[PDB]
Design a protein around this motif. Structure first.
Motif, PDB file in Angstrom:
ATOM      1  N   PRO A   1       0.021  -6.768  -6.071  1.00  0.00           N
ATOM      2  CA  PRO A   1      -0.049  -6.035  -4.808  1.00  0.00           C
ATOM      3  C   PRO A   1       1.312  -5.965  -4.155  1.00  0.00           C
ATOM      4  CG  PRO A   1      -0.787  -8.261  -4.475  1.00  0.00           C
ATOM      5  CD  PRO A   1      -0.515  -8.132  -5.950  1.00  0.00           C
ATOM      6  N   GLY A   2       1.379  -5.356  -2.983  1.00  0.00           N
ATOM      7  CA  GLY A   2       2.634  -5.221  -2.285  1.00  0.00           C
ATOM      8  C   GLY A   2       3.504  -4.188  -2.963  1.00  0.00           C
ATOM      9  N   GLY A   3       4.600  -3.854  -2.304  1.00  0.00           N
ATOM     10  CA  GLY A   3       5.370  -2.773  -2.863  1.00  0.00           C
ATOM     11  C   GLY A   3       4.605  -1.463  -2.748  1.00  0.00           C
ATOM     12  N   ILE A   4       5.052  -0.480  -3.524  1.00  0.00           N
ATOM     13  CA  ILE A   4       4.413   0.826  -3.541  1.00  0.00           C
ATOM     14  C   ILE A   4       4.327   1.317  -4.975  1.00  0.00           C
ATOM     15  CG2 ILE A   4       6.344   2.418  -3.392  1.00  0.00           C
ATOM     16  CD1 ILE A   4       2.798   2.523  -1.974  1.00  0.00           C
TER      17      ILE A   4
ATOM     18  N   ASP B   1       7.203   1.703  -6.828  1.00  0.00           N
ATOM     19  CA  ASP B   1       7.866   0.503  -7.316  1.00  0.00           C
ATOM     20  C   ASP B   1       7.351   0.075  -8.681  1.00  0.00           C
ATOM     21  OD1 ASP B   1       8.745   0.792  -4.715  1.00  0.00           O
ATOM     22  OD2 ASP B   1       7.289  -0.661  -3.962  1.00  0.00           O
TER      23      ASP B   1
ATOM     24  N   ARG C   1       2.601  -2.306  -9.164  1.00  0.00           N
ATOM     25  CA  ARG C   1       3.018  -2.837  -7.872  1.00  0.00           C
ATOM     26  C   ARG C   1       2.527  -1.876  -6.802  1.00  0.00           C
ATOM     27  NH1 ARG C   1       7.018  -6.062  -6.638  1.00  0.00           N
ATOM     28  NH2 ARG C   1       6.974  -6.864  -4.490  1.00  0.00           N
ATOM     29  N   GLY C   2       1.514  -2.285  -6.045  1.00  0.00           N
ATOM     30  CA  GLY C   2       0.864  -1.347  -5.152  1.00  0.00           C
ATOM     31  C   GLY C   2       0.552  -1.835  -3.753  1.00  0.00           C
ATOM     32  N   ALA C   3      -0.709  -1.717  -3.351  1.00  0.00           N
ATOM     33  CA  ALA C   3      -1.140  -2.132  -2.025  1.00  0.00           C
ATOM     34  C   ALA C   3      -2.106  -3.305  -2.098  1.00  0.00           C
ATOM     35  CB  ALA C   3      -1.787  -0.951  -1.291  1.00  0.00           C
TER      36      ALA C   3
END
Lengths: 521, 524, 98, 185, 525, 105, 74
Positions: free
Chosen positions: A198-201, A204, A370-372
């Motif tokens: 998670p985190g990033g976009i 990324d 790497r997302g939400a």
């Protein structure tokens, strides 16, 4: 009291209709979910979690039922998903609707067997139909594949990110080709590891020229950054391991006890110098690591990792081309961890990760997601799973199909051409299945939400002209569109098993006449 | 009917509190309970109290913290103020009583201004700045910063109050022994650790017969003889008194006959050699909590030796310091330099309790022990409890300095001074500090309650007599004279630091409990 | 559905003051009456049997009190005194209560 | 049960050494024959796995007992419960080998299953099933299972009977007349 | 429908579940909105186990506020991610979320199909991030720059005074942290807390503090000059990994067997002591040892007779800080023992508190690992401030990480709004609606800021809705007068990635949130 | 608060109850907005006694659709007047009502 | 899980149907049952039928209405 003591039984048309009805439900609950204009569904797992996903399989894979044919329908979904990935957006919706009209001759008192008999005839022409209306494509050309992939992926929420995945899917797919089968090299999607963080976009997330490890250096003194390291895959543990024969010692003299303790020290150190003799740089093992040896391996400034999962060890091995060893004394330099363009261990934020990049021509790779939030990520990769899967199918066959229902009408009249020329009672089933086919573009209309009847009649009218076969239904305009400019292009084999699966469903449910419960064994 | 609606079904069964209503009412009411719960508590006229726990165990007490520790509270902020004082006692000792009083009055007054509509945050600021100012003016009231380290008479006079505070009956005895206690200990491991004092409860022989010994005791048995020596040779071993059992399994195995004869004989023989080697050093008493070999003590009895048994890790740790001798994990080496050395050690029988006596005279400084005699152990538990708090008092006295006047007098100056600063604030907060000054009235007010005489005029009289700087005069303790007494001559003083900290903690307690607005409570 | 927060646990009993104080005074008076007859050259002794069925006679009230498993707290203090005096001097522990 | 007791620590390393070397030398002894495919219903250790990779070998663990029996009868291999010799030393012979054109594991339905092509010693036949659901395959094999038998019987008995219920059609009447023969009840 | 398939199953519908979800967040945002903004109120939680909170960072609230509505749990996850990403503004993040969905609802309540609005959001964020990218202020690692930012962040949670005290420690740590290229925040940051003497006196220690003490009274409490032994190998007894049954025949051997068994550890400790004596031939110097495992009392005695400080059973990360503290060479094998392998400290003592023991490391010449020792009056507050601390640090790590910085207090959002409201339907028109609300949703931050500050919302927004001139400024809302403010001039800032990720995070959250129709629940019994 | 007065009592609060009514009426209006208009559809109601409706005048529907939310019943009464006054646009009134509050909210 | 939400608790327990689904599906099927119930009914070749009422009374029938009269359909 005679038979099985409170095990229910049923027979005949009521059974027939009941299976007919349930599938009608079964298909119906998802008819919203296909198409570039589809919807997207979120699910309650029984144990609390959330999965939000458009791919029907998992939806049905996440469905609990009591009626059997639904569960029978369930596996059919997962099977084609397993073999093909998508079309699950459509196959079942094809399936039940086939059944939906399939019933319509039950009141015609026509024995289903013939209706089956026509079906097997029907599919034969269908497969022959598609082969006639297929299009081979070059596989070396990236951009069409990228076009194919977006054509393949402009159905899921990652639609906004088509550029990334298309190259992302292509790159990993291309880099997996195991040529020791002569020119019969085969790719694997289990060496296509997927890591969701998670985190990033979305931007990324990227394809990594190597492997990513959710572990850390055992000791700080080992460097966290190296250009061209040498890597060791020790399948065996690094420490003293049981004398397997329930061994026993009887010391009598004082020095003996202290002697033996050195010996384990000695035994461990023995292992260390055997390692260093190949001048390695990186140590990887699925088991534990003696810190005392790790002192030695620290003393050699040689990077060490303990207790790493075996599949990753393989992919790590497949990353740097080296081969795993369980025998330090029989370790061989042909498995030196050469093929390592950069060694590093980054900090993701509360987690060290192991960074293994720039292998010369790596065969294994993991995709870094790497997302939400992981449910977002997990949704993504499922779409990725389909994306990469079809590509290898494209890598398995270069022949392509124009979808958008264009092909569907093509067979539809083709069977109608067959239908009128195939006089007999079986004719009416034959056209009926053709009648079944027409729904998929129709279904597409509703997901767009347009005047389905008029457009469909025109499309059929449009496809009455032989000169044009790529005329299909645009996802968003809801207008008749030739595919060549539209570019929604599909693997032929995808559609084959689609119909192959579809018809198999039909026959299997049709021969049914009876229900039996309470087996008690 | 019967059908309201919910805009938030977020909760599975839980308590959502909001709207300041509980804050403006329920939080405040809960605290006000605590005040009444222990309103009677502080006061030389304040009275003791008993409780049984959820395991139904008696606890007669005068300290608030202990009973507070005996109260399974459930309201959120209640515990906060509980735990605030909990550490405060962990910080100073007594004060539990007072800070709880501080807790309510500030709380009690605060809602009214909150009910008057002042900003909740503004309440914090005025309360805050006043506290900082209150600390600022505080040292200006110190009197009789007694300095004598190691006299009995000064310290006893000082220490009397806390004993007087939580025990009105028998101050004279309690001080002198506890003063004897403080003097008997010097800074040996560093500035009179409270743990340096040990307490032994023996029922019977009422309190007046209780005294203090310059050594240490054990209500324990003995296995051999019973002797006390003018020159005691003490042997200390965490090691159990048996042949040093190798932790890994060496069982004897024999292959011929005579090993049977030889082994047990030598098995005896070296044990005699072991214990002799001990006796060669003249050790007359041996100590351990660990297991004792029967022949070994059989040998010690053969050698006129004393033995100690089954004591805990703390027990040896206490004793190890007493003669200053090192416990030996190795059984053999009866080290001369690390050898025990006592004035006299024997066994006593007190209250039908076998009792091992370490009667000592230690010029270098000793952790002596206090004898508790009297009937009800319940009395012992508190009667030690108060002395223990006095022990802190001496140590907290021993911390830095600066006796300050007790008996509410200091608080009266505080209020007036804080009142005085109040009008020099001017601003909407002025009332809060004005209330902040006021709340300090509670102590003498509660003191009057525990005195059970008409408070307000006494407060006014105390005010009036405090308009001439009379910082040494305070509330009397008398039904005859419900007016006043001068604390300085009465010696009713207290700690700067204790007053200082308790002020701060209660302050901290407020802003916190004041801070929060809406609450959530899951089902237990 | 808001609810007021209780102070302590449900059923955490409290009773305060004169009526509270006197109750024990009666309770203590209750205690002695079980020992009232006891001491004296023409005094008295009691038999109490446990719920186990093992009977136990006694003339020393402290022993009787130890048998008399008290549930009132303040009375247990009385019971404690007996042990102390019994650990000190013995009969008249009888008297001690009275 | 054979206990290992040490009063002289100096050879435990040598003891522990040989513990696997026996398996190792067995690996070496069989490999020296040059054998390229092996099965073992027993467990297979990673030490062996590593060694075979060094050989680039082919090995199978936990194969069902009957199939390898078919394999030995198919490939001409000798299933070997162990290594041995009419002389005491455990030896191994190439003559024990089984032989076939080509062996592949192939992922059908994304799962790699192993294929054997044309054992020269004894021609073999196996059938791969493809279908929609697991429900379809396991039934159709039963029909297939029955499918074999009937032909096997036809092979077993070189004689046929016409299907479609002619039997009783003829039987009914022929008995119907034959009934009159007895004259009883 | 599928209720036909299953009776006990539960399904929602497109209209139905849509309202449910938006209703869910609308409630969820309502509770949390009290918090962000320095004037906000932290919240106290009580466990069913009776534990206690005083928190304000919503992720803690969400993670601990027991709710069942799924979307919230989904929203909780990303918020936790954001906590794992930056730490605060999770506050704002959810407030962004539901409010967007609320504004989103307004149009679909007009029957607008959500798919269109999503694309409007898609375009909207792009332009915003485009603006977001350009508007960040490139700032050096000026101590004051970060200092204000730290104060900017830290005020979100505690007293103005308390953070101000806290502000100095964290920044100097940050200064004493970097090897000018890469922070990891784990070793060099030691967060230890003691229930001791205040909240405010919580301080940076230039050295290190330990959670345990020596196990022997003769052990030196305090040492002027410390020479450090970092290790993990047990100096407790151990018996070898092989079954090794021994006997004897004589009790004399039994004792001979006593001594032999000890001899191995005897040498081990012997190697060090000689080294110590090889090292600390001087009497003044003091020698300290640290073990990650335990130590034999006899070994303890072995050191005791030599007056050697040693510690056992350390957490696996402490030695790194020790190596980052004393430059000591952490080892396992004592046979390869060198004085150069040692660590050196300028001062060590032990601090005894309560029942526990705490140990103190002082006076590294160039310490590279430090400690946030937390002095506490109350347990929850220690936990309370700690979150504020870890939040505060993670603010700075990004703050140094990004050579740019965003002025805080929502001045950006108006800047977002005006630029985004300054977007013609260069969009296909229908998306300009969703963009409009998208921009509309952005103004919540100051709105709640004024709301949390009590000032009337509508007028203040209009007030600050005055880009002044060619210098249409990055203008904030005063947090105490509700007035236009230069956050930059007043030094109110924020991490760019913070602003970056949250927009991205929320947007992706939003579109998918709007893109569900029914919520299925058909699971096994 | 008044829970102090009574445990079995029930009370709301300002934001709370306000939020309830708007949702109640907005919930109410959503059901009926399917009705009015010649292109609208009448709705069929089923009695617990098995009786049947085919009407579109919501007054019958509201009067016959059993709801427990008071404001809805409150709405029922005033509409009951309106039908007693005119009969149609009763539909309008309620749809008017809720969307009014919707903007008001 | 275990806790979906309701946007309209208007009903104290009742059946509200919507989305045309019943109309498009449930309404039709029930009708289809009736056809299946009496499809055999008419015909010189159509055969009679008997049903027992709720009060256990016999009714042999070929006329649909009468047998229809015997059905408490819901």
């Amino acid at each position: 009291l005679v038979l099985s003591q409170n095990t229910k039984r049923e027979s005949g048309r009521k059974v027939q209709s009941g299976n007919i009805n349930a599938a009608k439900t079964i298909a119906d609950i998802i008819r919203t979910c296909l198409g570039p204009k589809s919807m997207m569904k979120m699910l309650l797992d029984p144990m609390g979690g959330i999965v939000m996903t458009n791919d029907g399989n998992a939806i049905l894979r996440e469905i609990q039922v009591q009626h059997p044919a639904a569960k029978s329908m369930i596996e059919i979904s997962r099977t084609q998903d397993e073999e093909v990935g998508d079309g699950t957006t459509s196959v079942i919706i094809l399936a039940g609707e086939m059944l939906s009209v399939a019933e319509h001759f039950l009141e015609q008192q026509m024995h289903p067997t013939v209706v089956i008999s026509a079906y097997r005839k029907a599919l034969d022409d269908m497969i022959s139909t598609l082969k006639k209306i297929s299009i081979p494509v070059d596989i070396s050309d990236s951009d069409m594949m990228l076009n194919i992939i977006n054509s393949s992926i402009t159905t899921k929420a990652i639609s906004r990110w088509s550029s990334l995945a298309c190259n992302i899917a292509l790159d990993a797919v291309k880099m997996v080709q195991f040529e020791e089968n002569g020119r019969k090299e085969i790719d694997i999607k289990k060496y296509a590891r997927v890591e969701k963080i998670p985190g990033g976009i979305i931007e990324d997330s990227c394809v990594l020229r190597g492997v990513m490890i959710n572990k850390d250096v055992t000791h700080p003194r080992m460097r966290r950054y190296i250009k061209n390291p040498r890597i060791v895959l020790l399948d065996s543990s690094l420490e003293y391991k049981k004398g397997e024969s329930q061994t026993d010692i009887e010391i009598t003299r004082e020095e003996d006890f202290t002697r033996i303790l050195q010996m384990e020290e000695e035994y461990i150190q023995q292992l260390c110098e055997d390692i260093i003799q190949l001048k390695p740089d990186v140590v990887i093992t699925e088991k534990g690591i003696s810190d005392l040896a790790q002192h030695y391996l620290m003393r050699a400034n040689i990077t060490a990792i303990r207790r790493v999962r075996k599949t990753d060890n393989n992919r790590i091995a497949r990353a740097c081309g080296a081969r795993i060893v369980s025998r330090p004394e029989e370790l061989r330099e042909d498995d030196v961890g050469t093929g390592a363009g950069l060694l590093e261990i980054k900090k993701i934020g509360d987690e060290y990760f192991t960074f293994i990049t720039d292998c010369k021509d790596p065969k294994a790779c993991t995709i870094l997601l790497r997302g939400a939030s992981k449910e977002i990520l997990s949704e993504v990769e499922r779409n990725l799973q389909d994306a990469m899967q079809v590509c290898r199918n494209v890598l398995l066959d270069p022949q392509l199909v124009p979808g958008g229902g264009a092909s569907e009408m093509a067979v539809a009249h083709a069977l109608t051409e067959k239908s009128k020329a195939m006089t007999g009672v079986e004719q009416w089933p034959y056209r009926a299945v053709a009648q079944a086919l027409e729904v998929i573009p129709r279904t597409l209309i509703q997901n767009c939400g347009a005047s389905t009847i008029r457009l469909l009649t025109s499309l059929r009218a449009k496809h009455t002209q032989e000169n044009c076969e790529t005329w299909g239904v645009n996802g968003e305009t809801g207008t008749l569109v030739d595919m060549k400019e539209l570019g929604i292009w599909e693997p032929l084999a995808v559609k084959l098993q689609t119909y192959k699966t579809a018809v198999e469903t039909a026959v299997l449910l049709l021969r049914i006449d009876d229900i039996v419960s309470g087996h008690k064994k | 009917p019967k059908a309201p609606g919910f805009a938030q079904m977020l909760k599975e069964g839980a308590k959502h509190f909001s709207g300041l209503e509980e804050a403006v009412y329920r939080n405040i009411q809960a605290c006000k309970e605590l005040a009444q719960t222990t309103r009677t508590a502080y006061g030389p006229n304040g009275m003791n109290k008993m409780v049984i726990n959820h395991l139904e165990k008696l606890f007669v007490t005068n300290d608030a913290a202990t009973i507070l520790r005996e109260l399974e509270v459930q309201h959120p902020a209640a515990k906060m103020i509980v735990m605030a004082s909990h550490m405060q006692e962990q910080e100073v000792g007594d004060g539990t009583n007072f800070v709880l009083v501080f807790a309510g009055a500030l709380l009690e007054l605060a809602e009214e201004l909150l009910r008057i509509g002042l900003s909740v945050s503004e309440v914090i600021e005025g309360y805050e700045i006043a506290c900082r100012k209150a600390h600022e003016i505080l040292p200006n009231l110190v009197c009789c910063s007694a300095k004598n380290l190691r006299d009995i008479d000064e310290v006893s006079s000082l220490l009397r109050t806390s004993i007087m505070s939580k025990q009105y009956g028998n101050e004279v005895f309690l001080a002198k022994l506890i003063a004897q206690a403080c003097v008997s200990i010097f800074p040996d491991s560093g500035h009179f650790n409270v743990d340096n004092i040990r307490v032994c409860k023996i029922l019977g022989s009422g309190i007046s017969s209780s005294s203090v010994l310059h050594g240490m005791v054990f209500k324990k048995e003995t296995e051999g003889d019973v002797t006390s020596v003018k020159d005691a040779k003490i042997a200390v071993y965490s090691c159990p008194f048996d042949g040093m059992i190798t932790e890994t399994k060496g069982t004897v195995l024999i292959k011929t006959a005579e090993e049977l004869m030889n082994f047990s004989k030598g098995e005896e023989n070296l044990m005699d050699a072991q214990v002799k080697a001990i006796a060669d050093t003249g050790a007359n008493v041996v100590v351990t909590g660990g297991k004792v070999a029967d022949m070994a003590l059989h040998y010690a009895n053969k050698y006129n030796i004393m033995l100690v048994r089954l004591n805990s890790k703390w027990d040896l740790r206490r004793l190890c310091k007493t003669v200053g001798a090192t416990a030996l994990p190795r059984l053999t080496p009866p080290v001369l330099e690390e050898m025990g050395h006592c004035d006299s050690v024997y066994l006593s029988e007190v209250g039908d309790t076998q009792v091992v006596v370490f009667k000592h005279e230690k010029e270098d400084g000793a952790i002596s022990t206090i004898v508790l005699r009297g009937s009800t152990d319940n009395l012992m538990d508190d009667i030690e409890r108060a002395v223990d708090d006095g022990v802190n008092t001496f140590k907290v006295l021993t911390r830095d300095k600066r006796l300050v006047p007790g008996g509410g007098a200091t608080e009266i100056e505080l209020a007036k001074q804080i009142t005085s600063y109040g009008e020099t604030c001017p601003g909407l907060e002025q009332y809060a500090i004005k209330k902040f000054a006021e709340a300090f009235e509670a102590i003498p007010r509660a003191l009057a309650e525990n005195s059970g005489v008409k408070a307000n005029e006494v407060i006014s009289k105390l005010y009036a007599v405090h308009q001439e700087g009379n910082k040494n005069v305070g509330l009397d303790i008398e039904a005859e004279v419900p007016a006043v007494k001068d604390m300085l001559e009465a010696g009713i003083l207290d700690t700067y630091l204790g007053k200082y900290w308790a002020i701060k903690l209660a302050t901290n307690a407020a802003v916190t409990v004041l801070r929060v607005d809406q609450i959530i409570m899951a089902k237990p | 559905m808001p609810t007021p927060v209780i102070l302590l646990k449900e059923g955490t009993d409290s009773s305060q003051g004169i009526p509270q104080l006197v109750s024990n005074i009666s309770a203590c008076q209750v205690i002695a009456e079980a020992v009232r007859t006891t001491l004296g050259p023409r005094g008295m002794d009691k038999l109490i049997v446990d719920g186990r069925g093992k009977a136990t006679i006694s003339n020393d009230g402290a022993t009787i009190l130890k048998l008399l498993d008290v549930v009132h707290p303040a009375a247990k203090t009385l019971v404690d005194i007996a042990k102390s005096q019994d650990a000190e001097v013995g009969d008249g522990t009888t008297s001690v209560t009275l | 049960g054979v206990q290992v007791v040490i009063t002289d620590p100096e050879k435990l390393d040598q003891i522990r050494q040989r513990e696997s070397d026996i398996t190792k030398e067995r690996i070496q002894k069989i490999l020296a024959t040059g054998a390229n495919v092996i099965l073992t219903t027993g467990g297979i250790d990673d030490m062996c796995l590593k060694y075979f990779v060094e050989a680039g070998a082919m090995a199978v663990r936990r194969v069902l007992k009957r199939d390898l029996k078919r394999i030995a009868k198919a490939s001409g291999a000798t299933i070997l419960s162990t290594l041995a010799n009419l002389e005491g030393e455990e030896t191994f012979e190439a003559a024990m080998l089984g032989q076939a054109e080509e062996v592949v594991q192939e992922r059908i339905c994304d799962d790699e299953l192993i294929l054997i092509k044309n054992t020269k010693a004894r021609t073999s036949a196996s059938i791969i099933l493809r279908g929609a659901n697991d429900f379809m395959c396991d039934e159709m094999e039963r029909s297939l299972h029955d499918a074999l038998c009937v032909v096997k019987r036809v092979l077993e008995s070189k004689s046929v009977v016409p299907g479609g219920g002619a039997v009783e059609a003829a039987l009914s009447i022929y008995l119907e007349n034959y009934a009159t023969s007895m004259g009883s009840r | 429908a599928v209720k036909t398939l299953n009776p006990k199953a539960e399904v929602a519908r497109a209209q139905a579940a849509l309202a449910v979800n938006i209703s869910a967040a609308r409630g969820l945002q309502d509770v949390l909105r009290t918090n962000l903004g320095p004037k906000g109120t932290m919240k106290m939680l009580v466990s069913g186990a009776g534990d206690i909170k005083l928190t304000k960072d919503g992720n803690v609230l969400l993670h601990e506020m027991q709710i069942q509505h799924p979307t919230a749990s989904l929203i909780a996850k990303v918020a936790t991610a954001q906590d794992d990403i930056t730490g605060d503004g999770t506050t704002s993040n959810v407030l962004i979320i539901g409010e967007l969905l609320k504004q989103a609802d307004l149009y679909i309540s007009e029957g607008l199909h959500p798919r269109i609005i999503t694309e409007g959001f898609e375009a909207a964020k792009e332009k915003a991030l485009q603006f977001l990218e350009e508007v960040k202020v490139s700032r050096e690692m000026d101590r004051e720059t970060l200092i204000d930012v730290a104060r900017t962040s830290l005020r979100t949670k505690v007293h103005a005074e308390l953070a101000d005290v806290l502000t100095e420690a964290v920044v100097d740590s940050i200064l004493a942290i970097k090897k000018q290229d890469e922070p990891i925040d784990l070793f060099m940051i030691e967060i230890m807390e003691m229930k001791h003497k205040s909240e405010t006196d919580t301080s940076l220690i230039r050295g290190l503090v330990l959670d345990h003490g020596a196990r022997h009274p003769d052990m030196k409490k305090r040492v002027e000059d410390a020479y450090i032994l970092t290790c993990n190998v047990s100096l407790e007894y151990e018996k070898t990994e092989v079954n090794s049954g021994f006997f004897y025949k004589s009790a004399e051997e039994r004792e001979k067997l006593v001594k032999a068994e000890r001899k191995f550890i005897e040498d081990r400790v012997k190697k060090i002591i000689e080294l110590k004596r090889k090292v600390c031939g001087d009497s003044d110097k003091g020698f300290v040892v640290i073990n990650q495992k335990g130590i034999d009392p006899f070994s303890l005695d072995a050191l005791s007779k030599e007056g050697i400080v040693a510690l056992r059973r350390a957490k696996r990360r402490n030695m790194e800080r020790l190596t980052l503290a004393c430059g000591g060479v952490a080892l396992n094998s004592f046979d390869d023992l060198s004085p150069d392998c040692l660590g050196h400290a300028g001062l060590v003592y032990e601090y005894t508190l309560g029942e526990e023991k705490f140990t103190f490391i002082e006076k590294c010449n160039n310490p590279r690992s430090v400690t946030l020792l937390i002095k506490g009056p109350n347990k929850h507050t220690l936990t309370q401030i700690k979150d504020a601390v870890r939040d505060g640090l993670r603010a700075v790590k990004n703050a140094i990480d990004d050579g740019c910085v965003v002025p805080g207090a929502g001045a950006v959002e108006v800047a977002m709004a005006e630029a985004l409201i300054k977007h013609k339907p260069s969009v296909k028109g229908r998306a300009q609606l969703g963009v409009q609300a998208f921009a509309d949703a952005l103004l919540i931050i100051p709105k709640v800021l004024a709301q949390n500050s009590g000032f009337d919302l509508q007028e203040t927004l209009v007030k600050i809705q005055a880009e002044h001139s060619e210098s249409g400024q990055l203008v904030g809302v005063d947090l105490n007068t509700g007035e236009p403010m230069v956050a930059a001039e007043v030094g109110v800032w924020d991490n760019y990635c913070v602003k970056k990720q949250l927009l991205h995070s929320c947007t992706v959250i939003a579109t998918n949130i709007l893109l569900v129709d029914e919520i299925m629940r058909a699971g096994m019994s």
